[PDB]
Design an enzyme around this catalytic site. Structure first.
Site, PDB file in Angstrom:
ATOM      1  N   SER A  14      39.019  32.001  40.573  1.00  0.00           N
ATOM      2  CA  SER A  14      38.572  32.707  41.800  1.00  0.00           C
ATOM      3  C   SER A  14      38.793  34.193  41.754  1.00  0.00           C
ATOM      4  CB  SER A  14      39.154  32.131  43.103  1.00  0.00           C
ATOM      5  OG  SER A  14      40.271  31.271  42.904  1.00  0.00           O
ATOM      6  N   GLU A  46      37.047  20.497  39.543  1.00  0.00           N
ATOM      7  CA  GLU A  46      37.202  21.057  40.886  1.00  0.00           C
ATOM      8  C   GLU A  46      36.010  20.975  41.848  1.00  0.00           C
ATOM      9  OE1 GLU A  46      38.684  25.124  41.253  1.00  0.00           O
ATOM     10  OE2 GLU A  46      36.668  25.886  40.887  1.00  0.00           O
ATOM     11  N   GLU A  68      31.190   8.797  46.335  1.00  0.00           N
ATOM     12  CA  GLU A  68      30.572   9.602  47.404  1.00  0.00           C
ATOM     13  C   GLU A  68      29.592  10.573  46.786  1.00  0.00           C
ATOM     14  OE1 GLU A  68      33.476  10.303  50.556  1.00  0.00           O
ATOM     15  OE2 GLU A  68      34.944  10.546  49.004  1.00  0.00           O
TER      16      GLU A  68
END
Ligand SMILES: [Mg+2]
Ligand SMILES: [Mg+2]
Ligand SMILES: [Mg+2]
Ligand SMILES: [Mg+2]
Ligand code: NA
Ligand code: NA
Lengths: 300, 300, 306
Positions: free
Chosen positions: A283, A247, A196
């Site tokens: 994060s 990720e 994809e």
């Protein structure tokens, strides 16, 4: 040394330039002597004989030829040979990097690909006005490399939007290319993969590895091993071995500094080809990190 | 004080709405009076005479007109005018912002573009079933803007997937739009550029500048909207990067990085500033520190 | 307890397998008994009668059928049933999840879609050479799902590049799909939306929500992937962003930010939570601090989160 040979239906422009060649049944052969020759009447297969002719609106001709490559390690020396090379990859007769795919850009003609067949750039606007008498004139693209599926549909494969797969792509059985997938020439999958994102020229993806939506695999030569996962919108500028994860949304370039479990850091290229790696951006700290998967620890 | 003119082939819907207009040879003229008229028999060029007619399945007619624009500064007054404008841009007779491209959305008809030509939305399902007697009915898009290459293929250009270039796109010689590239109307390149990411309406990219795979120029939430941005010469946007400010010459945005007008960037001195304050500066490298996570700008 | 029915033009491959079925006028019916029958001559609509036949080059046949689904909660029984379901969605007669869309991949045939019509994979290279006597053979794709617009063009909608919308996508009036937009089956918009990014199967986007160019909704590694996500109303996903949790109304995800279910986000009280914990909340703005690099969530309306 392996050669190759194929009977082809070539389309030439008005000035004699080779626009394309479709080879229905390419094959590998003993090393031999490079040449393309026009097929004598009795050597044209019956299915191709009805296809030979001249198109006065396009100012093209379609002819039946036989192309031989004496050695697949030689560079293509003309469009016929280039087209044969691209068919070999797409028929999966040769895997990416199994033949010399260099210089093809230099050798191939830029073509106006239309709903009336291949056309030259030269005089195209006049040709468009002539062809319009027949109905609508649709140009699919203007480029050196046409759509794989317009030459061969390989088996065990799905391609949601076939504009996104170049002839010369190698798609192994169980492979699916979704709308956002792109596969270049001399590139593709060795086994079952969900694709994809973008597989650059020369990039090979191992069995069971998936490329998430909008992921970018840089040319660099980069490869991915088995069972890897690139998250959607991720990017990869190094090779990965097996069982690696990048990720969603992380671009890993060769010069990206990655911090390791020991808190030491290295440029990402130092990890190229390694297995069992998970790349993420923290994060809380914003730092690119690499984690060992499956209690396997990390190998530089 | 610059106008334009063109003899076109227009297709009208059953109710008279202009679906499209193809102008083989548009031109700049001295300023004049905006109007479209139907050509008299003796003024229809010979190559166009054979293309005039009525399609009873589609309920359309194709007619020969001449469209004059009195002033390229005026807004498009009707769809013929609007088409003539978009052809001027794609022919490169006019550069982006070289003419008033405002208000086209309001002027253009929404069209079902098919392998049988343009069709109106009204009564389309009845039309589809009629055309199916001719063969398969394929709809390429439903939109106000068609595919550039179906009107003109400009020279010195490659377009891998011509679904991605709207009529109105301006692609200078040396430009290649790859599969993931996209170029809107009133936008494009002024020179030789590799485009593999997205050029929004109004956006211009200078000679030598490359746009990496999946890059976003002026996309959603890139900044407060007002002014269009532009890229100068020899710029480089990394794959999957984003830009919401203008760059001058010799700038780099690292792969994976979205620099929006409101992104706070840290300078070599340790002082930060919003990226819009650097809008249009040259020799700038934008990147994200793989270690601290901060967006930094460096001199190159 | 709702069913559906439709008269269809089905194309079958040489071995009899169903390639596709085009239903001009699908409709909802009382619950009933699933079956597909071959229409009798007198029951074939005049418009379709002209379209029935056998193609010797493709070795296919086109036949007129009537397909009935007894209950839309049942799984598709076969490919006719499958295509009927995808028509009901794309005709907006059923919103996403308003019918059982499970199991299609298993039921649907993989098809070579060409400029001469649907073709089987089997014997395709000999078919191609035969079809080339008619002119060029272009393959649009090799897939179990075809292009929506080749069955129905819904009103009030623009689709810049119709290769990017599968039959089965639901596109409410006022929706535009741009070139980078993508809409899968059983997925789409409930109201007016600008769609320039990717809507996965089962994903629903609320009225007035826009999806920026290159945005990824529910993409690979976006979340543990057991339940579908949705976006409520007046949400905005920045270009190149990603989303792996559901958003309520009036949420924004900044350009270039991928918010996955497992992303840790720092709230205004300086606490932090995995984004999945915010799933379905309204009035959130997600951004990555350009100075600290931390992923942060803010309240957008002057009125908090917790
Ligand atoms: Mg296998
Ligand atoms: Mg794309
Ligand atoms: Mg296409
Ligand atoms: Mg609310
Ligand atoms: Na396309
Ligand atoms: Na509305």
């Amino acid at each position: 040394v392996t050669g190759a040979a194929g009977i082809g239906l070539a389309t030439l422009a008005a000035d004699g330039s080779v626009l394309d060649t479709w080879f229905p049944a390419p094959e590998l052969t003993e090393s031999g002597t490079s040449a393309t020759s026009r097929l004598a009447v009795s050597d044209v297969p019956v299915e191709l004989a009805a296809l030979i002719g001249r198109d006065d609106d396009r100012r093209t001709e379609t002819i039946a030829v036989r192309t031989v490559i004496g050695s697949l390690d030689d560079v293509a020396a003309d469009p016929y040979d280039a087209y044969l090379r691209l068919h070999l990859l797409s028929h999966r007769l040769v895997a990416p990097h199994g033949l010399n795919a260099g210089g093809l850009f230099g050798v191939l003609t830029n073509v106006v690909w239309t709903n009336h067949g291949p056309c030259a750039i030269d005089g195209f606007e006049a040709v468009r006005a002539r062809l319009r008498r027949r109905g609508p004139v649709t140009v699919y693209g203007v480029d050196k490399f046409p759509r794989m599926v317009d030459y061969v549909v390989p088996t065990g494969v799905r391609i949601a939007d076939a504009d996104r797969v170049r002839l010369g792509a190698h798609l192994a059985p169980g492979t699916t290319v979704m709308h956002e997938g792109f596969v270049n020439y001399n590139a593709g999958t060795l086994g079952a993969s969900m694709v994809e994102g973008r597989i650059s020229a020369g990039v090979v993806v191992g069995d069971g590895s998936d490329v998430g939506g909008g992921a970018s695999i840089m040319g660099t030569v980069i490869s991915i091993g088995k069972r890897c996962l690139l998250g959607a919108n991720s990017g990869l500028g190094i090779s990965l071995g097996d069982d690696c994860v990048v990720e969603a949304g992380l671009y890993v370039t060769a010069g990206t500094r990655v911090t390791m479990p020991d808190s030491n850091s290295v440029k990402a290229r130092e990890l190229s080809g390694s297995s069992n790696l998970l790349f993420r951006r923290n994060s809380v700290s914003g730092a690119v990190e690499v984690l060992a998967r499956d209690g396997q620890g990390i190998a530089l």
